[PDB]
Amino acid sequence: GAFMFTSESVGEGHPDKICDQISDAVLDAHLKQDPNAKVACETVCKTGMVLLCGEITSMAMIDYQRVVRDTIKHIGYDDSAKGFDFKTCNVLVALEQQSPEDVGAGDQGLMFGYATDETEECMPLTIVLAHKLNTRMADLRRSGVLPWLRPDSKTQVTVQYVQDNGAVIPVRVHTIVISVQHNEDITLEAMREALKEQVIKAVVPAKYLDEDTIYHLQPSGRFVIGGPQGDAGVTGRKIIVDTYGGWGAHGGGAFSGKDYTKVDRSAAYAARWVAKSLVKAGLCRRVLVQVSYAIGVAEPLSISIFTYGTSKKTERELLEVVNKNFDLRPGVIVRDLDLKKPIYQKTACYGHFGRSEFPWEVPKKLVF
Amino acid sequence: GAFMFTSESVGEGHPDKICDQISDAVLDAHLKQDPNAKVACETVCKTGMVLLCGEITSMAMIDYQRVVRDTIKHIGYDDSAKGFDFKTCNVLVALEQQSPEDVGAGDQGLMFGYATDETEECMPLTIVLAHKLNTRMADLRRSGVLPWLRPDSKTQVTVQYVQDNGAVIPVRVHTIVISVQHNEDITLEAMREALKEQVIKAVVPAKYLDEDTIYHLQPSGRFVIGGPQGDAGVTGRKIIVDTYGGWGAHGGGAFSGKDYTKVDRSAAYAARWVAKSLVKAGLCRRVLVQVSYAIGVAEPLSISIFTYGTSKKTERELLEVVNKNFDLRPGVIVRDLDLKKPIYQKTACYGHFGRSEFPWEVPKKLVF
Amino acid sequence: GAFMFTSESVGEGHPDKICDQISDAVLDAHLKQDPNAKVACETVCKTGMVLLCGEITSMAMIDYQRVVRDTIKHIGYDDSAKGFDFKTCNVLVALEQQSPEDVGAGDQGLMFGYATDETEECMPLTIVLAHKLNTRMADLRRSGVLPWLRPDSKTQVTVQYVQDNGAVIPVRVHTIVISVQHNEDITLEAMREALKEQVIKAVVPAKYLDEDTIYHLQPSGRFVIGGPQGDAGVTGRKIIVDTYGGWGAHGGGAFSGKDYTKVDRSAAYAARWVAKSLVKAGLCRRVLVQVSYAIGVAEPLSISIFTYGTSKKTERELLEVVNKNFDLRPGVIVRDLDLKKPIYQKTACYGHFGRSEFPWEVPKKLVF
Amino acid sequence: GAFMFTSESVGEGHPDKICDQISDAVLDAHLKQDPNAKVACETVCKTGMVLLCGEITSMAMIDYQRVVRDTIKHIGYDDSAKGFDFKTCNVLVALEQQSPEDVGAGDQGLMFGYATDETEECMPLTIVLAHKLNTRMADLRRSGVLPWLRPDSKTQVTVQYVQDNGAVIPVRVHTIVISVQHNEDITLEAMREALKEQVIKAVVPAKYLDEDTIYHLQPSGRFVIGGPQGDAGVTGRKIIVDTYGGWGAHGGGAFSGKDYTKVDRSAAYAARWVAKSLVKAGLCRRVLVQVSYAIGVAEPLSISIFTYGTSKKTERELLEVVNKNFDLRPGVIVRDLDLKKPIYQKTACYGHFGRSEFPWEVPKKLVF
Numbered sequence A, B, C, D: 001g002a003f004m005f006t007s008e009s010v011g012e013g014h015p016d017k018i019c020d021q022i023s024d025a026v027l028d029a030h031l032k033q034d035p036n037a038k039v040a041c042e043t044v045c046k047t048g049m050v051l052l053c054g055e056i057t058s059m060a061m062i063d064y065q066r067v068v069r070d071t072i073k074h075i076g077y078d079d080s081a082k083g084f085d086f087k088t089c090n091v092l093v094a095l096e097q098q099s100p101e102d103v104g105a106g107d108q109g110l111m112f113g114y115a116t117d118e119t120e121e122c123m124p125l126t127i128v129l130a131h132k133l134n135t136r137m138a139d140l141r142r143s144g145v146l147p148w149l150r151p152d153s154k155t156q157v158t159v160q161y162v163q164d165n166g167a168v169i170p171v172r173v174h175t176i177v178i179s180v181q182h183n184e185d186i187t188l189e190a191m192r193e194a195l196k197e198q199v200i201k202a203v204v205p206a207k208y209l210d211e212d213t214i215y216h217l218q219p220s221g222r223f224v225i226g227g228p229q230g231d232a233g234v235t236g237r238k239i240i241v242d243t244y245g246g247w248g249a250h251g252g253g254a255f256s257g258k259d260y261t262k263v264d265r266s267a268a269y270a271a272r273w274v275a276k277s278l279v280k281a282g283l284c285r286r287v288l289v290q291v292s293y294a295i296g297v298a299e300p301l302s303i304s305i306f307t308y309g310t311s312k313k314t315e316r317e318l319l320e321v322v323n324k325n326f327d328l329r330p331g332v333i334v335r336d337l338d339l340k341k342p343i344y345q346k347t348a349c350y351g352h353f354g355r356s357e358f359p360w361e362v363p364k365k366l367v368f
């Protein structure tokens, strides 16, 4: 039942993603000394100018200059011409820091969860490839293979699909668009060649690459001193690339900069968890689990499972499977998923869902 | 086939929405003197401090201090204690301004469109009510009826649904959460009373209000000097409340601050247009139209119509209906929808979809 | 030998003076936990926006948000309309903080010292009155006597003089100009009356007030919401009001924000010390002691005493008196004057010279 | 009657001087299109971040981005590593601009004027050399002779003097300290050599250079990426280097950023004018003319001439000479000195007094 889809992703150098990382870096820096630290911060950046804002109630001694500059360094901004230098950029800290199981969900909410068997990650091929494409570029950048490669990049992958008496089966990569920052001493012809052979063909399964597959490598020509500027960088502005690439559903809640007590993050992770567990357990080929919460109440206020006719069990058979295998209460979520651990920075880029190294990405057994 | 859903919305005073409005205000200010003005700007705010960033190629003389301060005034920030005063706030303008039908879509893209017959607006009841709830508060604020009401507010509406051999029929409002800024001389008991009788019951259809409907009015107590700080307001960070409240699909593209030449805005409007037209023409009760574009190409690169079994015509009968009634090329979109007109500021709050006063909200005939 | 002179001073609310205080407040906050803390910081402010910049090598835990906001509170900025509220203003900290007798003067330098017997403070009458005028207003403000009085103020005092076979004898106050911020509920007539009776006549010696003395109280009319804005506030920009009101000599070195290791502060204090000691010891009625240093060298590189023919001893009689009573080496200065003590904030306003509560203002014995 | 003196100066790259220039650049940009433009602005900078503040009532169309960036370019900040790049730095404009002979002096004031015959410029040798030292470095920088030389520099000159039955005769240059920013590819040994032979010895008269003269060239080692940060540059913070290097007297008034209607600038210029005219006319070898003004009154409120016994005429013979040759009223000053002309930027660096190219530096005839 043919249709096509497109998804995107951005590198660690993207203005918005730098803020997402810095914000989560500050979250990590607190969890390491106080796992109960209340973090609520965000970052704004604009050409060698980083503004750290936020309200964080914690009891740990942190050098914000150090955590911000170290994060910028990690990203690859050490030289001037790159559009950012951790040693010279302005780090204005306007941060306010205080000191002092059946909890109860804060703020009325509605979190979504999604999973599909089109890839081993249980994530849309389009977004998976989009992320992996950026990931590979960072590898070649940090390894030395492609020393002209710079931190800021953007990726878009559009794949042609076809339904199947249930749902979504990828057929081939229709077109790929990739833009990456770079050094001056490297020709546009050499860049486009390396992007096709060393990055695209080194991550995209042969089955999907075609003789007609369209490539748009460095479409706008050069992107040298571009760097993280883009008029300004902000936290929580890359909401769709952090999730399913426009495939599931999204209420609008941002992750980065918020601790484990905010249902926007925790519950979203939990919903992904059960979604991935369901398909992994063969109970369905594609699911959209919807978990609702009521302010004050701990136990979820109605969870809905949305298979697209890919399950044999039948919604409200699968719900009991979830109700017998999962305890989606806020407090239990953080305990079961180990959400007091400082893994948030690595979650701030290349997507929150998909990578198996995260607790919520490890499928639960599911006793049926 | 019961399930519940929740959606939210924010008032004109919300930090993020202030930036969305200011950014669009600058867009309007340019279109009035140069309908071909290229606008690409964004705003950042934090307690009496507004930063205007952006690259705009236009040929019009604009007083940015005036357009920013006037917008803050319109919102209702004229006094000190409110958290913003257009006469005293810092307006730092870092804006860069230059001077000099079958066009061709910029940037590979994938826009979504959605519409449902559960309301006359052809929008989800949950988000419609959420918007109207905030709208009413602004009315009572500007009329004088509720003079304690201040600009910043947040609304959440969760409605219980039930499918119907096709899709989505609202049953009742399960719970409503509303928070609004306010003056000091007004008791929490009087506020909660006015919110229930004068705002909620004055906008929510009797059919949906219940004896069990849960109300959470000013849950966190007092919201006095809670003016636009919310730890830095930003443009394009309220992506879901500007669209369908998490009901359709969203690629992640922001509207505010971008002119009519960016497919992220125009094409999204166009997709909503055809979606609304389809249901209005009786061709379906709920649609998710998906329009894809290819960088360089003008004519859309595959449009998909997604009814949920609510149409009798059958997808790929409805597609020809769309292909015979619509010309979704970028240039034609702006011409047909009159996208060179300065209506963007009023679009920057209370949702981009739903209100009939916008071109894309006027259903096309559809000759079948 | 008649001539006239004018001097000025500003209140604790003056934008520049707020920065001078905040900068010294941060210096005090470090000395209390590490008397060897290396402080080099400055502040910038602009309508509810404070920027703390600087490089300080210390080993003490300081809450910059607390030291900045507490300083703004002390000044009297607690309400909105005053142009500053310590609870709501933006405190952007871009501060960089590290951790780890015959020393030797840093930076080639030339410090000046001045003293005259026209007042018990051994300071020019014009500047003394200018300072005391602002001091009194702060008292009436903090006591409650004049509750309409606000933090920001400016004072100018012009006195008619006459030489005397040696130098400078004040005759009468020619004119007085005073401007002070204020609350709305207070008439311009009542303000000008209180300024003349309760502040001017309560500080200016009867001998100097005349029937012709000109008064300019609140010349520019109102100064309500003025507050610390004045387009921006800066540290080290009120160099002359911090010293002798334009009577001695000034190389241009700023005090506030610099620790005791900078000869600009320490040596300037030392030079004032010897100047005051000389006149107090009857060795002269007016002196301008000039102390020069050489980078690397500890012992002063030539000290010059400049009496205006008011001494009977004779320059190079008085120099030996200084060389036998004083050891102006940097390290000795800080030890003798107790410059590791946190008294710098109170030094940041109303003048560095004149007030006896400071070590350098206590005359040394002088054995001749 | 031996004594020594020291003075300093800074290059066009010094943070404070950049702001002084930018502020005056904005003043020039207005005078060219509206000679009656009311300008009152100031600048703040910090590592690729320039903030333009101010209130200017004018009727001219100015591109502040252009005037700020052009000024930074002129200074020599075009590359990244230099600590500033006019093409990439953040120019935040928070400027507010409106549109619409016997005048009368604004604000009670007291301006000083000074002149000495120790040099042809009628300025202290110490400050003259200090300025010329920086000037020469800019020449070698812009010519190409010393291509490693960068914009930011600081100079200090200490000369040994001796009185002479009247006053001040320079004997020799005791020591010279000069620090200048530089490129990486240049040894500290080569820099110090070029500073002594090509800059110092090319500007300092043979008569003053000695075999004992002490040189401190690049004392602190390397000054590479030391571009304009210096922990925030500011306008009006280099008050003494803009005048007499600590030789005359200074009330504290800043020049840069203020138009010709502010007595702080105009009257100060006028006072220098008469001082220079007096010595040039042989009426004295050293003068300190003091001109006082009264708010509202046009005609100066008492002018005092202070010779140090170097005049044969006798104070109150010279006063009539001034009263018969000069009309120091504000309005007349601007007319006679042509103060509506855009020459203020070149006045913003290397000193306001001394250079003959300025109106106030052209001695008036003086008919006696």
Ligand SMILES: Nc1ncnc2c1ncn2[C@@H]1O[C@H](COP(=O)(O)OP(=O)(O)OP(=O)(O)O)[C@@H](O)[C@H]1O
Residues within 6 Å of the ligand: A010, A014, A154, A230, A231, B038, B039, B040, B041, B055, B056, B057, B107, B257, B258, B262, B264
């Ligand atoms: N000077 C400008 N002219 C036109 N568009 C601009 C300009 N500056 C920024 N933009 C923006 O870029 C968006 C569309 O194109 P594009 O996606 O190529 O930008 P980017 O710089 O690549 O952004 P990102 O990393 O999110 O893609 C628009 O929404 C528009 O606001």
Ligand SMILES: Nc1ncnc2c1ncn2[C@@H]1O[C@H](COP(=O)(O)OP(=O)(O)OP(=O)(O)O)[C@@H](O)[C@H]1O
Residues within 6 Å of the ligand: C010, C014, C154, C230, C231, D038, D039, D040, D041, D055, D056, D057, D107, D257, D258, D262, D264
């Ligand atoms: N809008 C403006 N028009 C004219 N002058 C201004 C304006 N804004 C600020 N000023 C400044 O004030 C100076 C002269 O007058 P005045 O001393 O009354 O200012 P203030 O606001 O009182 O300053 P301070 O506290 O140092 O006196 C000038 O140098 C000028 O730069």
Ligand code: MET
Residues within 6 Å of the ligand: A014, A152, A153, A154, A179, A220, A221, A222, A223, A226, A227, A230
């Ligand atoms: C040649 S423009 C490329 C810039 C890139 N879109 C960015 O993220 O800023």
Ligand code: MET
Residues within 6 Å of the ligand: C014, C152, C153, C154, C179, C220, C221, C222, C223, C226, C227, C230
């Ligand atoms: C009526 S204007 C007075 C303001 C005052 N000069 C200040 O310091 O800002």
Ligand SMILES: [K+]
Residues within 6 Å of the ligand: B041, B042, B235, B236, B254, B255, B256, B257, B258
């Ligand atoms: K945007």
Ligand SMILES: [K+]
Residues within 6 Å of the ligand: A236, A237, A238, A239, A252, A254, B236, B237, B238, B239
């Ligand atoms: K968002």
Ligand SMILES: [K+]
Residues within 6 Å of the ligand: D041, D042, D235, D236, D254, D255, D256, D257, D258
């Ligand atoms: K100034």
Ligand SMILES: [K+]
Residues within 6 Å of the ligand: C236, C237, C238, C239, C252, C254, D236, D237, D238, D239
């Ligand atoms: K100064």
Ligand SMILES: [Mg+2]
Residues within 6 Å of the ligand: A014, A015, A230
């Ligand atoms: Mg980008």
Ligand SMILES: [Mg+2]
Residues within 6 Å of the ligand: A179, A220
């Ligand atoms: Mg591009």
Ligand SMILES: [Mg+2]
Residues within 6 Å of the ligand: A008, B252
């Ligand atoms: Mg994007």
Ligand SMILES: [Mg+2]
Residues within 6 Å of the ligand: C014, C015, C230
């Ligand atoms: Mg002031």
Ligand SMILES: [Mg+2]
Residues within 6 Å of the ligand: C179, C220
């Ligand atoms: Mg005034």
Ligand SMILES: [Mg+2]
Residues within 6 Å of the ligand: C008, D252
């Ligand atoms: Mg002043």
